Write a protein that holds these residues in place. Structure first.
Motif, PDB file in Angstrom:
ATOM      1  N   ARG A  22       0.834  -1.195   0.000  1.00 20.22           N
ATOM      2  CA  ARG A  22       0.000   0.000   0.000  1.00 20.22           C
ATOM      3  C   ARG A  22       0.869   1.245   0.000  1.00 20.22           C
ATOM      4  O   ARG A  22       0.776   2.084  -0.897  1.00 20.22           O
ATOM      5  CB  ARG A  22      -0.940   0.004   1.206  1.00 20.22           C
ATOM      6  CG  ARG A  22      -2.073  -1.001   1.097  1.00 20.22           C
ATOM      7  CD  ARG A  22      -2.791  -1.191   2.426  1.00 20.22           C
ATOM      8  NE  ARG A  22      -3.560  -0.015   2.820  1.00 20.22           N
ATOM      9  CZ  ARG A  22      -4.207   0.100   3.977  1.00 20.22           C
ATOM     10  NH1 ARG A  22      -4.175  -0.894   4.857  1.00 20.22           N
ATOM     11  NH2 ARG A  22      -4.884   1.207   4.256  1.00 20.22           N
ATOM     12  N   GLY A  23       1.726   1.346   1.008  1.00 19.84           N
ATOM     13  CA  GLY A  23       2.584   2.504   1.168  1.00 19.84           C
ATOM     14  C   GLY A  23       3.487   2.790  -0.015  1.00 19.84           C
ATOM     15  O   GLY A  23       3.728   3.950  -0.343  1.00 19.84           O
ATOM     16  N   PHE A  24       3.992   1.740  -0.654  1.00 20.73           N
ATOM     17  CA  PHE A  24       4.911   1.909  -1.775  1.00 20.73           C
ATOM     18  C   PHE A  24       4.180   2.301  -3.058  1.00 20.73           C
ATOM     19  O   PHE A  24       4.674   3.115  -3.847  1.00 20.73           O
ATOM     20  CB  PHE A  24       5.735   0.641  -2.007  1.00 20.73           C
ATOM     21  CG  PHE A  24       6.830   0.811  -3.023  1.00 20.73           C
ATOM     22  CD1 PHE A  24       8.048   1.365  -2.661  1.00 20.73           C
ATOM     23  CD2 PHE A  24       6.641   0.424  -4.342  1.00 20.73           C
ATOM     24  CE1 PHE A  24       9.057   1.526  -3.596  1.00 20.73           C
ATOM     25  CE2 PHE A  24       7.647   0.585  -5.283  1.00 20.73           C
ATOM     26  CZ  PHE A  24       8.856   1.137  -4.910  1.00 20.73           C
ATOM     27  N   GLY A  25       3.000   1.722  -3.257  1.00 20.71           N
ATOM     28  CA  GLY A  25       2.234   1.964  -4.463  1.00 20.71           C
ATOM     29  C   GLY A  25       2.397   0.805  -5.421  1.00 20.71           C
ATOM     30  O   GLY A  25       2.484   0.989  -6.640  1.00 20.71           O
ATOM     31  N   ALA A  26       2.444  -0.399  -4.861  1.00 23.60           N
ATOM     32  CA  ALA A  26       2.598  -1.608  -5.660  1.00 23.60           C
ATOM     33  C   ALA A  26       1.532  -2.647  -5.317  1.00 23.60           C
ATOM     34  O   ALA A  26       0.737  -2.463  -4.390  1.00 23.60           O
ATOM     35  CB  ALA A  26       3.991  -2.192  -5.473  1.00 23.60           C
TER      36      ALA A  26
END
Lengths: 125, 125, 125, 125
Positions: free
Chosen positions: B72-76
């Motif tokens: 979520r945090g990374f964008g993956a």
DNA sequence: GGGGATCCCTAAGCTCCATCGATG
DNA sequence: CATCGATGGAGCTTAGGGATCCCC
DNA sequence: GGGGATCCCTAAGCTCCATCGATG
DNA sequence: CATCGATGGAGCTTAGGGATCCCC
């Protein structure tokens, strides 16, 4: 090879600025293009080459930079150089901002100032 | 050892246009970080790498938490790559996972469903 | 990658012909020039590239050969190609004996015959 | 692990003009074969590689036999390279070894005598 | 079932430890 | 009383070919 | 002795095993 | 009765920084 301690240091900064970040393994002796760190906050993605200097200028081999941009292009991130001078804060430089020497690149006293804070990096786009 | 499967999987990603990397030091305290991260300007992956002798593979709901938190945090997208003793790598989105309690799992029910690398890149379209 | 079994096979032949011989490790993914086998009987020293074919011709990449000769020159040995065809014996070819294709080298039906026995290799000088 | 000293020593040899190689599979049944073989057109080396925590290093007279048997057969000089926890690699000809019974050794008596790589190449003249 | 691509199990190494000896 | 799940451990070297398992 | 180049010891992981439970 | 030698075992993962040891 103290470089590691500064990679680890920066990771905290990134993580504190909202970036899921990691260090790249097999980075040195690698089968492919590999920067020092990779990060993303969901809106931005960063290919990063980390450097610590006692003092300017910082020189970056032609090759090194090719490899970072080659990777940054492929992965879908923005190629960046993070520079650390003792007393000062982490400064972030896009490869566009780099200056060409004869057979290489550099960041000197004329360029360091127009570098970015970690907070500017996250919310520019 | 199993390090020839490790780097074997990377090749696959690269093969498929993906720019993948091994996370430095992810045999580390339960730290939100995949074993691999890859991306190709469009699709980004957060990959927990499991090599099990046989089904089922169990996965503490905690272990899973981290993959999703990070992803979520990374964008993956969150994935579990899994190789079995004579079967080739096989990709499972977190969604595709079967649940129990303190854990999730992957056994005969879902295994044939697991995706292959290329089909993973193909999702975007 | 059956090549190994034939490397091991040849080593016995060499050892039987009086050659202290060895297989080169890190040969494939190597930090330097590295042939398949190295041997010396006190009078002669051999840098060797081992090859097994069902049938002629055998092609040898320009690079491969450069690497063997580069090494052979440095170490102080005679660069050789050992060829194995199913029914026949080990044949030994000095790099002088190789024929140039467009961007490579070869040993075909016109060259295989003028190759050497292991016994000729030891006592020619 | 100790594999960064292993390849560390190779570099040294190369550095000194030597074309060195790691013997494939020499954690093998007591087989006449050094751990490394090097040469530079003039001097050829057969090198048993030992990494001991402290002195003395004992060496079964058997273990030694093999190095000498091989060395003789190959046409090289027999050596024991030895690294200690904070000391750098250090080369000992078989001659320079101290004896006991079923073994030989290397302790304080001889250690400071041990050669350095360059001085080893220098012998030839 | 027969034929082939994939393993894993076997034998070995070294380094460090600790028993045990013998000799002083 | 067995099976699927879970819980708390311990082992963590290489390397080759005979043996296995899969698939057609 | 103080200052610096080199380690090693600490905390952790995973995979496989085996106990142990509970549920059918 | 301890020290140098020898004999027969077992452990064999990574990775970082605090702690060590050396050397000047």
């Amino acid at each position: 090879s103290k470089g590691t301690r500064f990679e680890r240091d920066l990771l905290v900064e990134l993580w504190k600025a909202g970036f899921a970040a990691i260090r790249v393994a097999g980075s040195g002796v690698s089968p492919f293009p590999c920067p020092d760190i990779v990060a993303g906050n969901g809106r931005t993605y960063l290919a990063i080459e980390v450097k610590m200097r006692k003092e300017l200028p910082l020189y970056l081999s032609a090759d090194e930079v090719e490899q970072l941009v080659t990777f940054a292009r492929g992965f879908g991130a923005e190629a960046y150089v993070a520079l650390k001078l003792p007393r000062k804060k982490w400064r972030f430089f896009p490869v566009q901002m780099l200056e060409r020497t004869e057979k290489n690149f550099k960041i000197d006293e004329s360029v360091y100032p127009l570098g970015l804070e970690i907070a500017e990096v996250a919310g520019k786009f």
